Amino acid sequence: DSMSRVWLTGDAVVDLIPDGQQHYLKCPGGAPANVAVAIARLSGRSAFFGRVGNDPFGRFMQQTLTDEQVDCQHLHFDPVHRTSTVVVDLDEHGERSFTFMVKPSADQFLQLSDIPSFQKGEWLHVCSIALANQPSRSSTFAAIAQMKEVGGYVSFDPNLREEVWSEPQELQATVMRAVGLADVVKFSEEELQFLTGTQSIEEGLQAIADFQIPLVVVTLGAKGALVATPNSQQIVSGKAVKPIDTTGAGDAFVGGLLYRLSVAQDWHNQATILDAVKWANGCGALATTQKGAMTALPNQAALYAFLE
Amino acid sequence: DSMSRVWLTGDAVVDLIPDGQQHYLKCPGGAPANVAVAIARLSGRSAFFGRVGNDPFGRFMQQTLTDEQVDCQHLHFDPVHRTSTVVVDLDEHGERSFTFMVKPSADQFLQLSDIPSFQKGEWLHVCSIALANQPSRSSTFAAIAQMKEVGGYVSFDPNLREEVWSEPQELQATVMRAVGLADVVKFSEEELQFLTGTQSIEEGLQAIADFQIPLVVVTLGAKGALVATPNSQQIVSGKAVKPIDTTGAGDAFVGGLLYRLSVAQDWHNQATILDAVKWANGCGALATTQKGAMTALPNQAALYAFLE
Numbered sequence: 001d002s003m004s005r006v007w008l009t010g011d012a013v014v015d016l017i018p019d020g021q022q023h024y025l026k027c028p029g030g031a032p033a034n035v036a037v038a039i040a041r042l043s044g045r046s047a048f049f050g051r052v053g054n055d056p057f058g059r060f061m062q063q064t065l066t067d068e069q070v071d072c073q074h075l076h077f078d079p080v081h082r083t084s085t086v087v088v089d090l091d092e093h094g095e096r097s098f099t100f101m102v103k104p105s106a107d108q109f110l111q112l113s114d115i116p117s118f119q120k121g122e123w124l125h126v127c128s129i130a131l132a133n134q135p136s137r138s139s140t141f142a143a144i145a146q147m148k149e150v151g152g153y154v155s156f157d158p159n160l161r162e163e164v165w166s167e168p169q170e171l172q173a174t175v176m177r178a179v180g181l182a183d184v185v186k187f188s189e190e191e192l193q194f195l196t197g198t199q200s201i202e203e204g205l206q207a208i209a210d211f212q213i214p215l216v217v218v219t220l221g222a223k224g225a226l227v228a229t230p231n232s233q234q235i236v237s238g239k240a241v242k243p244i245d246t247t248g249a250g251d252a253f254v255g256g257l258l259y260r261l262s263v264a265q266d267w268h269n270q271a272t273i274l275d276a277v278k279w280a281n282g283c284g285a286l287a288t289t290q291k292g293a294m295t296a297l298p299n300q301a302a303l304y305a306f307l308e
Numbered sequence: 309d310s311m312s313r314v315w316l317t318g319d320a321v322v323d324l325i326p327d328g329q330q331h332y333l334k335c336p337g338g339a340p341a342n343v344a345v346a347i348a349r350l351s352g353r354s355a356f357f358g359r360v361g362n363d364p365f366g367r368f369m370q371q372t373l374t375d376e377q378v379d380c381q382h383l384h385f386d387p388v389h390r391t392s393t394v395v396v397d398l399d400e401h402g403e404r405s406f407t408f409m410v411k412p413s414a415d416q417f418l419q420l421s422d423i424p425s426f427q428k429g430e431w432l433h434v435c436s437i438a439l440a441n442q443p444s445r446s447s448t449f450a451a452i453a454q455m456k457e458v459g460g461y462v463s464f465d466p467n468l469r470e471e472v473w474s475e476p477q478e479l480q481a482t483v484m485r486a487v488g489l490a491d492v493v494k495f496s497e498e499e500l501q502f503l504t505g506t507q508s509i510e511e512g513l514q515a516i517a518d519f520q521i522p523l524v525v526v527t528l529g530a531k532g533a534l535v536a537t538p539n540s541q542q543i544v545s546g547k548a549v550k551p552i553d554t555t556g557a558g559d560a561f562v563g564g565l566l567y568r569l570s571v572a573q574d575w576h577n578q579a580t581i582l583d584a585v586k587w588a589n590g591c592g593a594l595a596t597t598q599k600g601a602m603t604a605l606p607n608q609a610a611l612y613a614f615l616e
C-alpha cells in the first residue's frame with residue numbers, strides 16, 4: 001500500500017516544436033503534466049487537477065493524460081479560456097526557448113472548488129506558472145496549505161516562465177513564499193541564482209538556509225545534481241548524454257525523484273533520497289533523446305538498462 | 309496612375325493546418341492579410357494596417373507580408389498582446405474549421421492612431437473580426453468613416469467567426485452596421501442567410517435591399533457567384549475544381565475582385581464588375597489547390613492560363 005498518490009496541478013500545454021521547415025510537431029507538454037506522465041510511466045500513482053480549455057488542445061491533453069494512466073477525474077474544462085499553447089525555439093533552452101501564446105490560459109483560472117480531497121502521506125507537486133496570476137495563485141497556495149494540513153508532502157519546482165506573469169515584479173516574492181512551504185524544492189542552477197540574487201550555487205544555498213527546506217536539489221545539467229539536506233551537500237551524477245531535445249528534461253528529473261520518494265517507506269532517509277536522485281538523473285538524461293517533453297519519458301525497463 | 313491603393317486592416321494570423329499525423333504546417337493567414345497578399349500577387353498595390361503581437365508569429369507575419377510586397381509601414385507590434393493563432397480542422401470548412409487560441413489577440417487592440425492617411429479613390433477592405441471587440445471595433449468604424457469622408461471606397465466581407473466575439477449577441481447588429489457603410493459587400497450563401505435570418509439567397513437579398521448597397525456578391529462555392537447590383541442579379545461562374553484545401557478561398561476571391569476594381573477607370577461599370585468577378589472566381593478556385601490560405605494565391609500568368 002506504501003505507493004502514495006502524487007497529485008500534480010497546474011498547466012497542461014501543447015508545445016509546438018519545430019520539425020522540418022514549415023512544420024511543428026504537436027507535442028503534449030506542461031511541466032506538471034510532464035511530471036504526472038513521468039511518474040505513471042514508471043508505474044507510479046499520479047493524478048492531475050486543474051483546468052484546460054474546452055477546445056481541441058484541451059481535449060488532446062485530457063486524452064494524453066488518460067492514455068498515460070494519469071487520473072484525470074479532476075481535470076476540468078474551463079468554459080471561457082483557452083488551453084495554453086507554447087512555441088519552442090530549439091536554438092535556446094529552458095525558459096528562453098518558450099513563447100507563451102495564450103495568456104492567461106485556462107489553468108490560470110483554477111478555483112478553490114477545483115481542489116480535490118487529499119490524504120495523509122500523499123504528495124503534491126507545483127510549479128510557478130500556477131502562481132503566476134489570480135485566481136490560480138491563491139487557489140494553489142490554498143491547495144498547498146490543505147495538503148500540509150492533512151499530513152501530505154509538498155514538492156515545488158519553480159520552473160520559471162516570467163512572461164506568463166501579468167505582474168512580473170511579483171514573481172520573486174511569490175515564488176519564494178512557495179519555496180518556504182515545500183518539503184522538496186528543485187531548482188536549476190540558474191533559477192537558484194536568479195531567485196536569490198547570487199552568482200554561485202554556494203551563495204544561493206546559503207541564501208535559502210533560513211527556510212529550513214528539508215530537501216533541495218539543484219540540477220547541474222550534464223554534471224547531474226547537487227543534493228542539499230540539513231548539514232549535508234553531495235553531488236550525484238550519472239552518464240551524460242548529448243541532448244537531442246532538452247524540453248522538459250527537468251520535469252522528467254522531478255518525475256523520477258518523486259516516483260521514488262512516493263514509493264518509499266520513509267522518504268526522509270538519506271539512502272532513499274540519494275537513490276531517488278540517481279533515478280531522477282537517469283530520467284532527465286533519457287527524456288532528452290526525443291523531441292517533446294513526454295516522448296522519451298522512460299519506463300523502468302529502459303531506466304534500469306540505462307543506469308546499469 | 310489609375311492603379312489605386314487597397315488598404316487592408318484587421319487580423320494577420322498563423323493558421324496551424326494538419327499535415328501528417330502529429331504535425332501542423334505553419335501557414336500564414338488572417339483574412340485581410342490573405343486579401344492583401346492576393347492583390348499583391350496579381351501585381352496590385354496593397355498595404356496593411358493593424359497590430360500583431362511582439363512575438364515570433366507576429367514577426368513571421370510581418371516578414372511574410374513584406375516578402376509578398378505588401379506595404380507594412382503601418383503594421384505595428386502590440387506591446388502586450390499576442391498574435392492570433394488558429395487551429396484548422398480539415399474535416400470542416402469555413403468558420404466551422406477554425407479554433408481561435410488567442411482571444412483577444414493583438415489586432416483587437418487597434419487604436420485610432422493606428423489608422424493611416426487615406427486618399428480619394430483608395431479602397432479599404434474590412435472583415436468582421438476587426439469589429440469583434442473594443443477598441444478595434446470602434447477604431448475600425450472610424451477608419452471606415454474616414455475613408456468615406458475622403459472619397460475612397462469601402463469593401464466588407466463579414467467572414468464570420470463568432471467565437472472571437474466576447475459578446476456574441478452583438479455580432480448581428482454590429483456586422484450589419486458595417487454592411488450599411490460599404491460600397492461592396494461579399495457574403496458566402498450561409499453568411500447572407502445567417503445575418504438576415506432567411507432560408508434562401510432570394511429572401512436574403514430582399515432583406516438587405518433597403519441598405520442600397522452598390523455591389524453585393526454572394527459566393528456559391530462551386531457554382532461561382534451571384535452578382536447583385538441595382539435592379540440586376542446575375543450568376544457568374546467558371547471552372548469548378550475539387551478543393552484540396554478550402555482555407556481562405558473566399559479571401560482569394562475578394563483579392564481578385566478588388567484587384568480588378570482597384571485598377572479600373574470606373575469600377576461602378578457593369579462590365580468591369582462582371583469581369584472582376586470572373587477573376588475572383590478563378591482566384592478562389594486556384595487558391596484551393598494547396599494547403600494554406602496564401603500558398604496558391606495566383607499570379608496573372610497562372611490565372612490567365614486557368615481562365616483560358
Ligand SMILES: Nc1ncnc2c1ncn2[C@@H]1O[C@H](COP(=O)(O)OP(=O)(O)O)[C@@H](O)[C@H]1O
Pocket residue numbers: 093094188218219220221222224225239240241242243246247248249250251253280281282284285288
Ligand atoms: N546533457 C545531459 N546529460 C545527462 N543528463 C542530463 C543532461 N542534461 C540534462 N540532464 C538531466 O536533466 C536535468 C536538467 O536538464 P535540462 O536541460 O535543464 O532540462 P529542462 O531544462 O527541460 O528542465 C539534469 O539534472 C540531468 O539530470
Ligand SMILES: Nc1ncnc2c1ncn2[C@@H]1O[C@H](COP(=O)(O)OP(=O)(O)O)[C@@H](O)[C@H]1O
Pocket residue numbers: 401402496526527528529530532533547548549550551554555556557558559561588589590592593596
Ligand atoms: N469547388 C470549387 N470550384 C471552383 N471554385 C470554387 C470552389 N469552391 C470555392 N470556389 C471559389 O471560392 C469561392 C468560395 O470558396 P470557399 O470554400 O467558401 O472558401 P472560403 O470558405 O475559405 O472563403 C467561390 O465563390 C468560388 O469562386
Ligand SMILES: OC[C@H]1O[C@](O)(CO)[C@@H](O)[C@@H]1O
Pocket residue numbers: 011013015028029030031032034086098129159161247248249250251293
Ligand atoms: O518544463 C517544460 C514545460 O514547461 C512549459 O514551458 C510550461 O509548462 C511547457 O511549455 C513545457 O512542456
Ligand SMILES: OC[C@H]1O[C@](O)(CO)[C@@H](O)[C@@H]1O
Pocket residue numbers: 319321323336337338339340342394406437467469555556557558559601
Ligand atoms: O478566411 C480565412 C482566414 O480567416 C481566419 O479564420 C480569420 O482571419 C484565418 O484563420 C484564415 O486564414
Ligand SMILES: [Ca+2]
Pocket residue numbers: 159160188250251
Ligand atoms: Ca525546468
Ligand SMILES: [Ca+2]
Pocket residue numbers: 467468496558559
Ligand atoms: Ca470567408
Ligand code: NA
Pocket residue numbers: 245247248287288289290291292293294295296297
Ligand atoms: Na523529450
Ligand code: NA
Pocket residue numbers: 553555556595596597598599600601602603604605
Ligand atoms: Na490554399
